[PDB]
Design an enzyme around this catalytic site. Structure first.
Site, PDB file in Angstrom:
ATOM      1  N   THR E  29       0.741  -1.053  -0.184  1.00  0.00           N
ATOM      2  CA  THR E  29      -0.115   0.053  -0.055  1.00  0.00           C
ATOM      3  C   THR E  29       0.994   1.379   0.094  1.00  0.00           C
ATOM      4  O   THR E  29       2.152   1.224   0.513  1.00  0.00           O
ATOM      5  CB  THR E  29      -1.050  -0.089   1.417  1.00  0.00           C
ATOM      6  OG1 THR E  29      -0.110   0.225   2.336  1.00  0.00           O
ATOM      7  CG2 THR E  29      -1.624  -1.253   1.083  1.00  0.00           C
ATOM      8  N   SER E  30       0.169   2.368  -0.446  1.00  0.00           N
ATOM      9  CA  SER E  30       0.918   3.749  -0.404  1.00  0.00           C
ATOM     10  C   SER E  30       1.001   3.957   1.068  1.00  0.00           C
ATOM     11  O   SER E  30      -0.123   3.923   1.837  1.00  0.00           O
ATOM     12  CB  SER E  30       0.317   4.607  -1.237  1.00  0.00           C
ATOM     13  OG  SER E  30       0.618   5.714  -1.139  1.00  0.00           O
ATOM     14  N   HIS E  88       7.583   0.222   4.606  1.00  0.00           N
ATOM     15  CA  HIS E  88       7.210  -1.032   5.165  1.00  0.00           C
ATOM     16  C   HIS E  88       8.054  -1.758   5.527  1.00  0.00           C
ATOM     17  O   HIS E  88       9.349  -1.650   5.085  1.00  0.00           O
ATOM     18  CB  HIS E  88       6.263  -1.833   3.853  1.00  0.00           C
ATOM     19  CG  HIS E  88       4.894  -1.262   3.554  1.00  0.00           C
ATOM     20  ND1 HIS E  88       3.822  -1.150   4.476  1.00  0.00           N
ATOM     21  CD2 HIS E  88       4.387  -0.509   2.611  1.00  0.00           C
ATOM     22  CE1 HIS E  88       2.820  -0.561   4.019  1.00  0.00           C
ATOM     23  NE2 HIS E  88       3.284  -0.296   2.471  1.00  0.00           N
ATOM     24  N   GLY E  89       7.876  -2.950   6.148  1.00  0.00           N
ATOM     25  CA  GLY E  89       8.822  -3.872   6.420  1.00  0.00           C
ATOM     26  C   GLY E  89       8.419  -5.180   7.179  1.00  0.00           C
ATOM     27  O   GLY E  89       7.110  -5.288   7.293  1.00  0.00           O
ATOM     28  N   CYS E 130       6.893  -1.921   9.685  1.00  0.00           N
ATOM     29  CA  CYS E 130       6.449  -2.995  10.419  1.00  0.00           C
ATOM     30  C   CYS E 130       7.720  -3.849  10.595  1.00  0.00           C
ATOM     31  O   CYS E 130       8.567  -4.243  10.140  1.00  0.00           O
ATOM     32  CB  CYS E 130       5.256  -3.655   9.554  1.00  0.00           C
ATOM     33  SG  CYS E 130       3.998  -2.766   9.715  1.00  0.00           S
TER      34      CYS E 130
END
EC number: 3.4.22.56
Lengths: 92, 5, 139, 91, 140, 5
Positions: E29-30, E88-89, E130
């Site tokens: 996601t953006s 993100h992660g 994350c």
């Protein structure tokens, strides 16, 4: 509400992935250093600053001695993992 | 001597 | 600000000292861990902790001990301390007979599963390997 | 000699294994809080004590609001990982 | 000796990698809100006297390439080093716009023996990402 | 609204 993982602190003897070291006679480098810094500063310093002293003592005052060259002259850094939400003082 | 955990 | 540390008791300091391991593990005995466990007993005694030394516990004995400790009423205690002295690997501590997830140990004390410690510092001191890398150092 | 892994600090926004939360308008809970505490305290407090105050801010002042009940009313604790050997004062 | 020396001529670099828009082929996601973060961080570390560098929407290759380049600069006159990752992660992992990078691959460039002009100086990595998919339901 | 990273 607070998080269910809040107010935990994990004082690891060594960094993720790494061996941790122990002397046959004097005990593990980390616990050695922890008791000495607690003895010397539990009446003076906040707990995270005590563990920071423990980090520097392990990092600077210890180096492995082994007849096996593979395991000789090695170093260690402990790893403080804090989910604490407040300062922790062992004195009044 | 130093040993590993 | 600061954790309230003037409850009637500073709290428990559990020391698990695994020196001798079952041959199925291939693990060597941990010479010098007795010096650790004695150093820690004296250190936390001076900090007014109620110390409990436990020696050579299996992976099942550790889980059960941790469960039992988490079920006590810590309402009059300021904090909780647990010290694990053993072999390990990343995320894992060894009973005398095999590995235990550290997360399984620490989950007993989650703020929703140990209500009389909610809001109080829970310190886990872990002397154990976390892999097999060696730090060669610098300068 | 010092360890080659010494003098690292990793200020993670969340605990190992967990989601980290971000507000579509205000930004992430963690960075919001870290900037506020550094603004308020970088002239007075050692860095670990600043990061401890970020922990308390994220733990107590934030809770997730989501239309997806699966993701609603959740909480977050950041995770300070210090291999520092000294105290860090930003002045 | 108990405190890091922070009176070098410069406080140091502060690298901010702000990943907001990911290749649709990754499925990610953006990250609405992250520009507010990136700007908040720039102002904050500007007031701390860091030389701030903002980089946006980097691939895993550009992240690795930037980190290698920064770690090969001469930091002799810098007190510290700050890197901020917004993405993100997963556990141990930060995402570039096109896929994962191990955080350890990034941090290793600054490791005491591979970036000598930072040896002995604090290296700070601030990670907004994350670390898996668990949710914390809290306790009242 | 809040989103996860």
């Amino acid at each position: 509400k607070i998080p269910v993982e809040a107010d935990f602190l994990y004082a690891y003897s060594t960094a993720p992935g790494y061996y941790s070291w122990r002397n046959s006679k004097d005990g593990s480098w980390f616990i050695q250093s922890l008791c000495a810094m607690l003895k010397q500063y539990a009446d003076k310093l906040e707990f995270m600053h005590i563990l920071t002293r423990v980090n520097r003592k392990v990092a600077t005052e210890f180096e492995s001695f082994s007849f096996d060259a593979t395991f000789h002259a090695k170093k260690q850094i402990p790893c403080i993992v804090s989910m604490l939400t407040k300062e922790l003082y062992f004195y009044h | 001597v130093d040993k590993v955990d | 600000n600061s954790y309230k540390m003037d409850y009637p008791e500073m709290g428990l300091c559990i020391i698990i000292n695994n020196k001798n391991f079952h041959k199925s593990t291939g693990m060597t005995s941990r010479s010098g861990t007795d010096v650790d466990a004695a150093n820690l007993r004296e250190t936390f005694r001076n900090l007014k902790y109620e110390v409990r030394n436990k020696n050579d516990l299996t992976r099942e004995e550790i889980v059960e001990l941790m469960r039992d400790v988490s079920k006590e009423d810590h309402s009059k205690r300021s904090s909780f301390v647990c010290v694990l002295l053993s072999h390990g690997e990343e995320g894992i501590i060894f009973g005398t007979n095999g590995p235990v997830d550290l997360k399984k140990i620490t989950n007993f004390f989650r703020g929703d599963r140990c209500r009389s410690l909610t809001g109080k510092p829970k310190l886990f001191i872990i002397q154990a390997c976390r892999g097999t890398e060696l730090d060669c150092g610098i300068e």
